[PDB]
Structures are given as C-alpha cells and as structure tokens.
Amino acid sequence: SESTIENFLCRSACVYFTEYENSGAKRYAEWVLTPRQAAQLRRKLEFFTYVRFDLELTFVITSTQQPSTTQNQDAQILTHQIMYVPPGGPVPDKVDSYVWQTSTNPSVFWTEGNAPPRMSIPFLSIGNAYSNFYDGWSEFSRNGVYGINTLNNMGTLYARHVNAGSTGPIKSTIRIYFKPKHVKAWIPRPPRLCQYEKAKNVNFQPSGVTTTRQSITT
Amino acid sequence: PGSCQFLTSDDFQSPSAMPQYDVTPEMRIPGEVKNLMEIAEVDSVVPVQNVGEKVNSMEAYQIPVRSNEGSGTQVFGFPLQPGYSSVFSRTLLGEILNYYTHWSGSIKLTFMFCGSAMATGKFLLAYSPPGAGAPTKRVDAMLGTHVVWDVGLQSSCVLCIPWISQTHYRYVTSDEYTAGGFITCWYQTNIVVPADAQSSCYIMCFVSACNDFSVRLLKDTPFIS
Amino acid sequence: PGSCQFLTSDDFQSPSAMPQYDVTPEMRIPGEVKNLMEIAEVDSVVPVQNVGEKVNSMEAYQIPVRSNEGSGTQVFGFPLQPGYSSVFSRTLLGEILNYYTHWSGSIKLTFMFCGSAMATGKFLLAYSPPGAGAPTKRVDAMLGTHVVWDVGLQSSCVLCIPWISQTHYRYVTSDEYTAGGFITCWYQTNIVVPADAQSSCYIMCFVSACNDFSVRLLKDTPFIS
Amino acid sequence: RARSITLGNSTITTQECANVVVGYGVWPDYLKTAEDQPTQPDVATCRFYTLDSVQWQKTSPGWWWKLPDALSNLGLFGQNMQYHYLGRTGYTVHVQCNASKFHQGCLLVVCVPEAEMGCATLDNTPSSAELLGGDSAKEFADKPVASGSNKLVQRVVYNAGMGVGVGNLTIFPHQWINLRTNNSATIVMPYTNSVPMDNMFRHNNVTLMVIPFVPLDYCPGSTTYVPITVTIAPMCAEYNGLRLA
Amino acid sequence: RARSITLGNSTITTQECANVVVGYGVWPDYLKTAEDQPTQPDVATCRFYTLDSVQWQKTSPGWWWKLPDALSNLGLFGQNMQYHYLGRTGYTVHVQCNASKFHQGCLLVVCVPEAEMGCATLDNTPSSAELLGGDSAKEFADKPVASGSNKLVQRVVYNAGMGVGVGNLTIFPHQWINLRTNNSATIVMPYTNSVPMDNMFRHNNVTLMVIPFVPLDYCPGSTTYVPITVTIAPMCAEYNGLRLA
C-alpha cells in the first residue's frame, strides 16, 4: 500500500537554495527547472524510463538583516516576485529589466509574513512522457550532444525584490520544494549502484558489485 | 492552532500557474508500473562469492564447485536477511527493501547448476530455523529441513523460505544474524564426469519475492553518499 | 500555503467598483470573431520576392517569369515553415502563428498566373518531403510529388501541404530548414505568346490554413521592439 | 525435431519448443492525425536479417548490438531509414548458439530500452564511433577503461556501461541460455518510446546485450569457441506518407 | 524429467518411472491387547534419513547396513529407540547411484531378513563391534578371513557371511542396477518378525546388502569411483504406551 508510485514519488523534496539582496552585485535568483540536481529524488525517479507527472512548487523566502553601519533605519514590509518563465519564453538579463512585466510569464507577488507562496505547473511536454534516459543525440548533426532530448524542458524560475524595504542591506534566501503529482511510470529499470557525478549525464566511475565478506561459508 | 503553517507532508489544492492550457492526452506505452512490489518479484542474480577482489570482477556471482576434496565439505552459506546483508542488499529485492523500515514476507531462492550435460552429483541444501545456528556438519544439516538436489535429473532447484522480517532499525551490517535463518550447501556426492569433460563447474542463485510481502514506513536510502 | 498571494494568471471574482449601474445592452454588429483560427484561414499574398530593395516597394509580392533563358531553369523556391520564415512570417497565418510556441497542421497554397489571356506555358510545382533536400534539377523534381500546371487551361493551381509543425523553440531565422519541406517551381515549357502580346508575365501566391490546425502555449510577439 | 519459419524470402530453423518471451506482454501491433499527419506502412521490410556470427571464447566479456543501427545498411530497412524520416518498428531477436554436450557455460540475452551508455571521462560524452558499430558487434571489457582526455564509452562488463549492477539487468525482457539445457532465445520487443513516430538515425529504440555470466569451459580437443548467431526481424514497421493531401 | 517426494521436512529427487519393489506383495500397514497391552503410534519419525555416501571403486567387494542399527543415532528414530522399549517398523530403501554413460557395472540391492552372520572361528560367535557398524557401512572381503582365536565375522563376498551361494540371494526382495539402464532401486519392506513388537536394540529386523556382481570399469580420464547413496524412511512405526490404564 505504501509501495504505490503515488506514495513513493510524492514527497516534498528541497531541490534549490540561494540568496538575493536589495543592494550590491547579487540582486536576483534563477534556476532552470530540472529534477536531476538532488540525488535523493533523482535516484527514485531513475527507477523508471518514462514518467509523466505534474509539479507543485512551494517557496520558503526568509530575509535576514545583513551586518552594516547605515544609521537611522526603519524598514518597511518586503514584497517579493517569483516569475516562472514557461518553455520558449523571454528571460531577464538584469533585475530592473522590461521582461519582468511580460504578461505570459505567471509571476506571483507575495508580501513578507504570510503563508508561503505556491503554484502548480501542468505536464509541459509536447510529447507523451518525459524521458529519464535518452539514447540519442539532441540534433541530427554532429553538433548535437548525446543523451539530452529537448522535450524535457520544464522552463525556468526567476525571483527578486519588488522594492528595497529599508535603507540598509538585507539578504533574502529562497528554498524551492518539488512535489510530483498524478505520477505514471513505465518500463522499470535497475537502481544506480554507482555514485552520481554530474547532473547532465549518466557518466560514472566503475565500482564493485557489492560489499565484501570474510569467506563464502561465512 | 494548526493553520497558517507549511508542513512538508500535506495534500492540499494548489492554484495552477498556467491555466487554459491543453495537456497532451496519454498514449499506450508498454509496461506501466502500478506498484513497487512487482519489481521486487523478478529473480536477480545474487553475488554469493563477494570475497575480496571477487566483487570487482564478474566471478562474484558464480559459485565455484570442485569434485576433489568434497566428501562432505560445505559448498557455501549466508544468513537469510535480504536488506542490510552483503549478499542480498544490492539485488532488486534488497534495493526495494532498503527504502522501508518495516518489511515482512517470504523469499524464493532458485539455484541453477551451470555445468556440462554429462556431470552428475548431489547436494544437500539445508534451512536453519531463525534461532538455531548454522549446522556444523552434513549430519546436523540432514537432521533438519533439507532438500537433496540431484543435478543429473534436475538442473535447477527452487526454495521458498518463510518467517522473513525486519531484524534491526536504521541500517546494520553483521554476519550470522540472531533472528534470521541460514541457507547452506553440502557435497552429498562428488561431481562424476566422463573422460574429456571438465569436472570444475559453477552454480548461480536468483532471489525473488512472494504474494505475501508487506513494506511500511518509507525512509531514505543509505547507499547515497 | 498558496493563499494571500497575487498570481497574475488566476481567475477569481472581484468586487465591482460601481454597482447598481445598467450597462448598455448588446446590438448586432456584423462579423463577430469567435476564434483566431478563422482569421488564419483567409488567403494572404505572400512576398516571395523579398530580395534586396524589393521589400521596400510593391514588387516584393509579384514573382517575375521570363520566357527567354528558361528551358528547365528554376522559377522560385522557399522552405515550408510559416512562422519564423522571411517569406511567411509576416502574413496573417504567420502573424497568428508567432504568438504560439507549439503549432501543427496543414497549409494551403494558391498560385495565380497574372498574364495575358493569350499566353500559354507549363510549370512543374514540386514538393520535397521534410528530410529530403530541395531538388537540384527538373528531373529530380519530377521524380517526386509534382503537379504539372498548364496556364492555358487553368489560370490558378492549388496545393495542400501536410506534415507542417513547429521546428524550433523561441524564434529562429534560417534558410533551408532541416525538418521542413521545400516548394520549388520549374519551367517545363516556355511562355508562348502571339505577336503584339507581352511575354514577360508575373505570378502571385496566397497562403491559408486548414480545419486540422492546432495552436498551444501562447507567448509574446517578437516583432515588437 | 526442428521447425522452419518462412518470413518473406528468408527461412530459419528453430526447435519445436521455443519458449518465446513477449517483451511486456504486448505484441508489436500497428498504430491505432488524418490528413494533417498521413502515415504509410511497409511490409516487404519484414524478413529475417542474419547478422555476422561472433566467436564466444573463454576470455570473452560480452557484446552489444543497437537494434535500429545494426540493420542501418542491410536491404530495405537500411534504405527506408535513408528515404522516409519518421518511423516506428518492433523486433523479434533470435539469438541461437550451437555447442556440443561437452561444452559448459551460461549467457544472458537481454533487450534494454534507452541504454544510455557512460563515458570514461566524466566531463564529456562518448563519440558515436565508439558508441555505434555498424555491421559489427561492440564488445565489453574486463578491466575499467582508463580515463583521460578521450571520448571512450565506459565498457566494463559488471557496470554494463549504464552504471548499474549487472545482476539486476533481469528487470528487462530477457532469457538465459544454459549450454546443458536451453540452446536458443527468442524475444519479441514492442515499440517502446514517448512519441508515436521518431527519427531512426538520431535515436536507438532498443539495445541487445549478450553477456556470459559463467565462462565457457571445455577439455583440450573440443572446438575452442562457440559461434553465437543473431537473427533480427523488423515487425509492424510504418513510415510517414510522402504524398500531398 | 524428475520428481520430488516430500516426506515431512525432507525432500528427495527421483525418476518418473521408479519401478518400486514391494517386499512380499504387502504394504507396511499398521497393527490391526486393549488395556493390558496399550500401544501408541509415532508419525514425525517418518521422513527421509540420508546415510553417508560410499565410493564404489574397481576393487570393491560390497557393503551391508543393518536397518534398525543404522538409524540408531539419527533424529527421533535414534531417540525413540532409547525411550520406548517395544517397537515395530517398516522401511523404504532408496539406493541411488550416479555415473556417466562411459562407466559400466552391475549391483544387487537385496533386503535380507534375519541375516545371521557367521564367525571366522567356528567355536565362538562374532563380536557386536565387528557385526554392528553405526553411522558407517560395513564392507565385505575378497579372500576368506583368517581363522584363529578371534571374533571376526566371516565376510567373504561369495558366501555373503551367511554361508550360502551369493547367486541365490535373489529369493529375497531385490533389485538389480545396470549402469547402462537402471540408475536407482526402491524396496519397500514390511515388518517381518515372529512377534507383534520387539526390542529394537537387541534384534535387527532387516539387513541391506549391496554387492557388485560385475566390476566397475572406466577408461583413464573418467572419475575413478561412483558414489552410491542410500536413503532410509521408517514407515508405520508404533511403540508401547508408557501411560497407566
């Protein structure tokens, strides 16, 4: 009963943690949607070849007062904007760009001190199932990289500070949770055995089959 | 109390970021997984000879059998705990069982003698009950739950061990488990081969599951570093 | 989680700023648009000759045909991707298709020979399958899916190309698309005119859509600066 | 007694009992968008394509043949792949192995879908030359491939080049070959892919792996190898229509 | 094809055709004096007791195992004989022998009742040590045992130690084993004795003799022995009631 894929692949897993400020060089966050960065969830997803699911994104945004020497401070409430760029959509080159205003990118404004913001993304493949494993080239020409189908593109995620609250410096961290929903899986395949190296490929270092013992009669 | 809080394990309805978008209909792709138990019911080769450099090669799986010096000597032996045990923790069964904290059921074991079509012998596969220790000699093994396996007639012998359950919490590695049984093989007779036929032959083992298997309290996998 | 947040793409009920105000009833105005697909089904003149200063004039649309030096020479040619292609990205069809990221369907092409009522010739309209490259000669074009168009009998020839789909994400500009077909015209016979009749004549093309056309994932238009 | 199975021009000999292994309980049937996406089926393509035999010796790790790539050069299948663009097909492997009663060994014949191989160097991906072998099988390796600045596919036999345990490859449609009981293996593979039709030159649908778990052993005087032989038949293959609606 | 016969915990492999030899046309059934002589049956005792294998070589006269004595030390049967006093039992010998097609020989498996052995010295009787061998078979001899002042049991193979012609032992329930046809022998022995119940430590009910009439022969290179294997199962055994009327 706990072994159904709905009960095996529907756990809120943290897949990204970063920090952006109201002043300074770092002013926004970005993260191409891809589920292969967290190994604990990648290893569970890699039990099947093709998986079709929906995503529930939960963001935990917390702001800390950066140490500074600016006198006479009195902060206001901070408002954040999380803009989710759908596949084939314009992406911001800077914080105060004109791409944050585009209407086809469903951004969500959230005011500090409430329930965490949350939005649900539907199946975004132009095909019939996401492919955990691909045995081909991205392009017909030699230029195409091996094992990278352009059909598992889930989009990108940009976050920023709508306004600078106080006159002092403030750093805000954003944690992203991944929760797959309505999961269907096809063609089960063996577990990893080896350790993971990169997020883009299945490259690995050859390892033993299992752990050793004193003797065969032990 | 209990509202305006974010709990990781909650099932609520979420506002769709992109509505008015027609998702592609589903198609018929072969081999749809419904439950993880079906995966745990496929026989998987068991590395019985995980001794030294044997693991970093292909000979870890094969079990060596020699006609000489085996009047009644033991061929092999291992405890009967799938998950948490060097011989079974890496199979399909063991890999599924290393996700749950509580599991009980029955295990199926299949041995396939891989030798010439002209070799004949006998073996004495014995099953020790949980509390009882592994047998010291061939007689002790016979006075129990044995199966005399003749490789001339049958080329494959199947077992169905019951009373298999979780023996420890978290993850432990230990030889000779107290609450688990032991499967041992003894040379009842030696390998009898004619002229111009190799007398050194190998065996292989396949571990599966059964209809009466339960798995509860899913946790993290300990093989991730 | 998911409450007390402003999401741009949400459908909720809003409190009316001005209630108790009777809006004017609707009237019957001709030509009510129900879907954008109907607009994409009106034939639009296609600028085939978008070569140099031809675009900044009216001769971009007209295709020049000369009887002399055309025993088997090619008259014109272009890939078959509506949106993202110089020849079709600015028509009605292309302008509707530059709003969606995923579109598949069939395209209708109409050619109208605009010359004297006394001119006769033949043309060889060929359709190259997606993977296959554009034909090198008139023979290669004939050994495929051609249509021999006689301008003495018929003054207009219509085609219905299928397998038309999105070839790239975002916006790309490229001649000779890999996953798209090519439409080319060859001079089977030369233009035969009597005395006191111009032998230089022009053609025109009209691109439309079909009932089997889909458009999904609406995005921003790239023609806005 | 034996049998004969005539598909088109080809004829092959098989045992009365063949114990066929249908892939996922599904027979490779046809496809069940009108004028927008016309499709045309090809029949003569179906027939028995016999690949070159491979000699199985005592020191032999294993082999691997990509099912679409292997026939990319033989008959109509090799031709159709060059002419038509999109195509969907199913297969029927017929791995047969002939050795006397005085030989001993064991082989695993497994059809793996989307067998994405690894690379010696973690930074880059394997070259298509070291990945695709046409008109010839590719062999595994006993020891690990030395890593460096190269695009050599990882080919260790135990990791299988996909970085898994070679004892768990049974999850996929498979069949064992004990030289003392079974002498052949038949596996019918349906069309497994996310899309109804795919380009056949840019994507391998299925991969055929034959790995000997138990080493071949024989007494001095017997033939020092065993000629494994593979026969592939494309089943229910259809391609895009090149006509004009 | 083979078969499996599960008696209690034990399981044994046998041919589809076993040609069982019921002893005297009688199956070893139960017993058909109220309170004066109460009797209690034991069931778990029934099971397959596999004795140690014996290597049959070219120079091998024969063997002999006393059916009550052989199991006097193994499991419940060994225990019950020590606890209860009077007991009646029936047997089911399963002499199996495995050798290749390149071996040749012939064996007689005979169950002899009241096999009273002779003694080298006519004046005295054989010692129980040279007569009873527990957990190990006793072997015959080629040449006569030298007579003297000793209690050595006469063990010449031709006289059989009972002083008869070894070609006439066929009168008793028996079975031949030709290494080119038969590979095993099954003999079901009923309870044969003057009394309904007898003391099991003071009287041997049946004796099992296995004598090779034709010597084992093989060419240099084959295994130089043949491991004969004996399995005994006590059948319908009952013992005296230790209760109080």
Question: Which labels suit this protein?
Answer:
part of a larger assembly; 5 chains; A: 218 residues; mainly beta; five-stranded antiparallel sheet; four-stranded antiparallel sheet; 2 helices; 9 strands; 5% helix; globular; D: 245 residues; Jelly Rolls; six-stranded mixed sheet; 35% strand; virus; CVB3; VP3-234Q; A-particle; Capsid protein VP1
CATH class of chain D: Mainly Beta
The coarse silhouette of chain A is globular
Helical fraction of chain D equals: under 10%
Topology pattern of chain A, helix = H, strand = E: HEEHEEEEEEE
Question: What this model shows, in words?
Answer:
Chains B, C: It comes from Coxsackievirus B3 (strain Nancy). Chains B, C: This is Capsid protein VP3. This is part of a larger assembly, with 1 copy of chain A (218 residues), 2 copies of chain B (225 residues) and 2 copies of chain D (245 residues). Chain A contains 2 helices and 9 strands, in the order αββαβββββββ. In chain A, the strands form 2 sheets. In chain A, strands 1, 3, 6, 7 and 9 form a 5-stranded antiparallel beta sheet that branches. Chain A has a 4-stranded antiparallel beta sheet with strand order 2-8-4-5, with no helix packed on it. Chain A has helices at 5-8, 39-45, and strands at residues 13-21, 28-32, 48-65, 79-85, 108-111, 118-121, 130-131, 156-161, 170-188. The radius of gyration of chain A is 21 Å and the shape is globular. Chain A has 218 residues and is mainly beta. Chain A has one domain. In chain B, 5% of the residues lie in helices and 34% in strands. In chain B, the strands form 2 sheets. In chain B, strands 2, 3, 5, 8, 10 and 11 form a 6-stranded antiparallel beta sheet that branches. In chain B, strands 4-9-6-7 form a 4-stranded antiparallel beta sheet. Chain B is elongated, with a radius of gyration of 23 Å. The two termini of chain B are 38 Å apart. Chain D is mainly beta and 245 residues long. Chain D has a single domain, classed as Jelly Rolls. Helix content of chain D is 7%, strand content 35%. Chain D is built from 3 helices and 17 strands. The longest helix of chain D has 9 residues, at 75-83. The radius of gyration of chain D is 19 Å and the shape is globular. Classes of the chains: A mainly beta (218), B mainly beta (225), D mainly beta (245). At the A-B interface, helix 1, helix 2, strand 3, strand 6 and strand 9 of A face strand 1, strand 4, helix 1 and strand 11 of B.
